[PDB]
Protein backbone atom coordinates (compact mmCIF):
# COMPACT_ATOMS: atom_id res chain seq x y z
CA UNK A 1 0.00 0.00 0.00
CA UNK A 2 1.39 3.42 -1.07
CA UNK A 3 0.01 6.81 -1.96
CA UNK A 4 -0.51 5.89 -5.61
CA UNK A 5 -2.14 2.50 -4.87
CA UNK A 6 -4.05 4.38 -2.25
CA UNK A 7 -5.66 7.15 -4.41
CA UNK A 8 -6.06 4.90 -7.23
CA UNK A 9 -8.41 2.94 -5.09
CA UNK A 10 -10.21 5.92 -3.89
CA UNK A 11 -10.11 7.67 -7.13
CA UNK A 12 -11.01 5.23 -9.79
CA UNK A 13 -9.92 4.92 -13.39
CA UNK A 14 -12.12 6.45 -16.08
CA UNK A 15 -10.96 7.14 -19.60
CA UNK A 16 -13.90 9.25 -20.48
CA UNK A 17 -14.68 12.62 -18.96
CA UNK A 18 -17.14 12.62 -16.27
CA UNK A 19 -18.56 14.64 -13.41
CA UNK A 20 -17.83 13.93 -9.81
CA UNK A 21 -20.41 13.70 -6.98
CA UNK A 22 -20.17 17.53 -7.13
CA UNK A 23 -21.09 17.64 -10.78
CA UNK A 24 -17.62 18.79 -11.97
CA UNK A 25 -15.99 17.52 -15.16
CA UNK A 26 -13.34 15.05 -14.43
CA UNK A 27 -11.19 12.26 -16.13
CA UNK A 28 -8.62 9.60 -15.22
CA UNK A 29 -7.64 9.03 -11.58
CA UNK A 30 -9.59 11.81 -10.06
CA UNK A 31 -8.09 14.59 -12.30
CA UNK A 32 -10.39 17.64 -12.13
CA UNK A 33 -10.74 19.25 -15.58
CA UNK A 34 -13.20 22.01 -14.94
CA UNK A 35 -15.84 23.24 -12.71
CA UNK A 36 -17.69 24.58 -15.58
CA UNK A 37 -21.03 23.37 -16.82
CA UNK A 38 -19.70 23.38 -20.39
CA UNK A 39 -18.64 20.11 -21.68
CA UNK A 40 -16.65 21.86 -24.39
CA UNK A 41 -14.66 23.80 -21.87
CA UNK A 42 -13.87 20.52 -20.24
CA UNK A 43 -12.75 19.04 -23.56
CA UNK A 44 -10.51 21.95 -24.41
CA UNK A 45 -9.22 21.71 -20.88
CA UNK A 46 -8.66 18.02 -21.43
CA UNK A 47 -6.66 18.72 -24.65
CA UNK A 48 -4.49 21.24 -22.88
CA UNK A 49 -3.75 18.84 -20.14
CA UNK A 50 -2.78 16.23 -22.65
CA UNK A 51 -1.59 18.62 -25.40
CA UNK A 52 -3.54 16.98 -28.23
CA UNK A 53 -7.07 16.96 -29.60
CA UNK A 54 -8.88 14.53 -27.37
CA UNK A 55 -12.62 14.74 -27.89
CA UNK A 56 -12.92 13.47 -24.35
CA UNK A 57 -11.09 10.16 -24.20
CA UNK A 58 -7.60 9.34 -23.24
CA UNK A 59 -5.44 6.29 -22.80
CA UNK A 60 -4.80 5.06 -19.38
CA UNK A 61 -1.17 5.64 -19.90
CA UNK A 62 -2.32 9.29 -20.33
CA UNK A 63 -4.46 8.84 -17.20
CA UNK A 64 -1.39 7.70 -15.34
CA UNK A 65 0.61 10.67 -16.55
CA UNK A 66 -1.86 13.18 -15.05
CA UNK A 67 -1.79 10.98 -11.95
CA UNK A 68 2.02 11.52 -11.55
CA UNK A 69 1.67 15.26 -11.90
CA UNK A 70 -1.25 15.46 -9.70
CA UNK A 71 0.48 13.41 -7.04
CA UNK A 72 3.60 15.57 -7.50
CA UNK A 73 1.41 18.63 -7.46
CA UNK A 74 -0.06 17.60 -4.14
CA UNK A 75 3.06 16.75 -2.16
CA UNK A 76 4.62 19.91 -3.54
CA UNK A 77 1.78 22.15 -2.24
CA UNK A 78 2.04 20.50 1.16
CA UNK A 79 5.71 21.01 1.23
CA UNK A 80 5.34 24.50 -0.35
CA UNK A 81 3.20 25.50 2.49
CA UNK A 82 3.69 27.72 5.41
CA UNK A 83 1.10 25.92 7.41
CA UNK A 84 1.27 22.43 5.87
CA UNK A 85 5.03 21.82 5.86
CA UNK A 86 5.18 21.78 9.58
CA UNK A 87 2.20 19.48 9.69
CA UNK A 88 3.35 16.89 7.18
CA UNK A 89 6.86 16.86 8.47
CA UNK A 90 5.40 16.14 11.86
CA UNK A 91 3.73 12.86 10.82
CA UNK A 92 4.57 9.19 10.17
CA UNK A 93 4.76 7.80 6.57
CA UNK A 94 1.29 6.61 6.65
CA UNK A 95 -0.51 9.58 8.09
CA UNK A 96 1.60 11.52 5.58
CA UNK A 97 0.18 9.32 2.78
CA UNK A 98 -3.24 10.19 4.02
CA UNK A 99 -2.37 13.87 4.15
CA UNK A 100 -1.50 13.76 0.37
CA UNK A 101 -4.69 11.95 -0.37
CA UNK A 102 -6.79 14.78 1.21
CA UNK A 103 -4.96 17.62 -0.50
CA UNK A 104 -5.02 15.83 -3.84
CA UNK A 105 -8.68 15.31 -3.47
CA UNK A 106 -9.81 18.71 -2.19
CA UNK A 107 -6.95 21.11 -2.64
CA UNK A 108 -5.04 23.60 -0.37
CA UNK A 109 -7.72 25.99 -0.20
CA UNK A 110 -10.21 23.66 1.26
CA UNK A 111 -7.52 21.98 3.20
CA UNK A 112 -7.42 24.90 5.63
CA UNK A 113 -10.94 24.29 7.01
CA UNK A 114 -9.09 21.24 8.25
CA UNK A 115 -6.72 23.19 10.59
CA UNK A 116 -8.19 22.31 13.91
CA UNK A 117 -8.14 18.58 13.05
CA UNK A 118 -4.60 18.64 11.77
CA UNK A 119 -3.95 20.50 15.00
CA UNK A 120 -5.59 17.88 17.27
CA UNK A 121 -3.62 15.53 15.22
CA UNK A 122 -0.60 17.19 16.34
CA UNK A 123 -1.94 16.64 19.83
CA UNK A 124 -2.46 13.04 19.19
CA UNK A 125 -6.10 13.46 19.60
CA UNK A 126 -6.90 10.95 16.92
CA UNK A 127 -10.31 9.98 17.93
CA UNK A 128 -11.33 13.50 18.30
CA UNK A 129 -9.45 14.60 15.19
CA UNK A 130 -11.31 11.84 13.53
CA UNK A 131 -14.79 12.68 14.55
CA UNK A 132 -14.01 16.21 13.76
CA UNK A 133 -12.98 15.36 10.26
CA UNK A 134 -16.27 13.58 9.53
CA UNK A 135 -18.09 16.54 10.29
CA UNK A 136 -17.37 18.05 6.94
CA UNK A 137 -18.69 18.96 3.60
CA UNK A 138 -15.89 16.57 2.42
CA UNK A 139 -16.58 13.61 4.43
CA UNK A 140 -20.30 14.24 3.53
CA UNK A 141 -20.21 13.94 -0.20
CA UNK A 142 -18.00 10.89 -0.05
CA UNK A 143 -18.19 8.99 3.10
CA UNK A 144 -16.85 5.79 1.96
CA UNK A 145 -13.69 7.18 0.77
CA UNK A 146 -13.46 9.91 3.51
CA UNK A 147 -14.14 7.19 6.09
CA UNK A 148 -11.06 5.42 4.68
CA UNK A 149 -8.78 8.44 4.82
CA UNK A 150 -9.81 9.26 8.28
CA UNK A 151 -9.44 5.75 9.63
CA UNK A 152 -6.10 6.03 8.04
CA UNK A 153 -5.17 9.31 9.76
CA UNK A 154 -6.48 7.95 12.95
CA UNK A 155 -4.87 4.59 13.25
CA UNK A 156 -1.57 5.21 11.62
CA UNK A 157 -2.27 2.02 9.66
CA UNK A 158 -3.57 0.63 6.22
CA UNK A 159 -6.41 -1.51 7.53
CA UNK A 160 -9.01 0.37 5.69
CA UNK A 161 -7.32 -0.37 2.49
CA UNK A 162 -7.25 -4.06 3.39
CL1 LIG B 1 3.56 1.92 5.38
CL1 LIG C 1 -24.19 15.85 1.74
Look up the CATH number of the domain holding residue 58: 1.10.530.40
How many whole angstroms from 145 Cα to the centroid of ligand 2? 14
Query: d(Cα 65, Cα 63) in Å, to the nearest integer?
Result: 5
Give the structural domain span for 62. Answer: 2-162
Cα separations in angstroms, 148 against 10, 95, 127: 9, 12, 14
In the reported structure, the alpha carbon of residue 158 is separated from the centroid of ligand 1 by a whole-number distance in angstroms of 7
Residue 27's H or E segment, with its range, is: strand 25-27
How was this entry determined?
Answer: X-ray
Can you tell me the distance from the alpha carbon of 7 to that of 113, in angstroms, rounded to the nearest whole number? 21
Helix (H/G/I), strand (E/B), else coil: 159: helix
8 A C-beta contact, residue 111 and residue 103: yes
CA distances from 62 to 16, 21, 54, 65, 140 (A): 12, 23, 11, 5, 30
Q: Which ligand is nearest to the CA of 134?
A: 2
Q: Which residues contact 15 (CB under 8 A, 6 or more apart)?
A: 27, 28, 57, 58, 59, 60, 63
Determine whether 11 is an active site residue. yes
Q: Going by C-beta distance under 8 Å and a sequence separation of 6 or more, which residues neighbour residue 1?
A: 97, 158, 161
Specify the long-range contacts of residues 31-40, CB closer than 8 Å, at least 24 apart. 31/63, 31/66, 31/67, 31/70
List alpha helices for 33-92, DSSP H: 39-50, 60-79, 84-90
Number of domains in the chain: 1
Active-site residue, from 5, 10, 20, 64: 20
62 annotated active-site: no
Amino acid sequence: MNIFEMLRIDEGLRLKIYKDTEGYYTIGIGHLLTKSPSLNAAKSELDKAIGRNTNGVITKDEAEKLFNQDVDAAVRGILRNAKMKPMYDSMDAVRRAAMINMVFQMGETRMAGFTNSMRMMQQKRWDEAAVNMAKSRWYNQTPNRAKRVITTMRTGTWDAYK
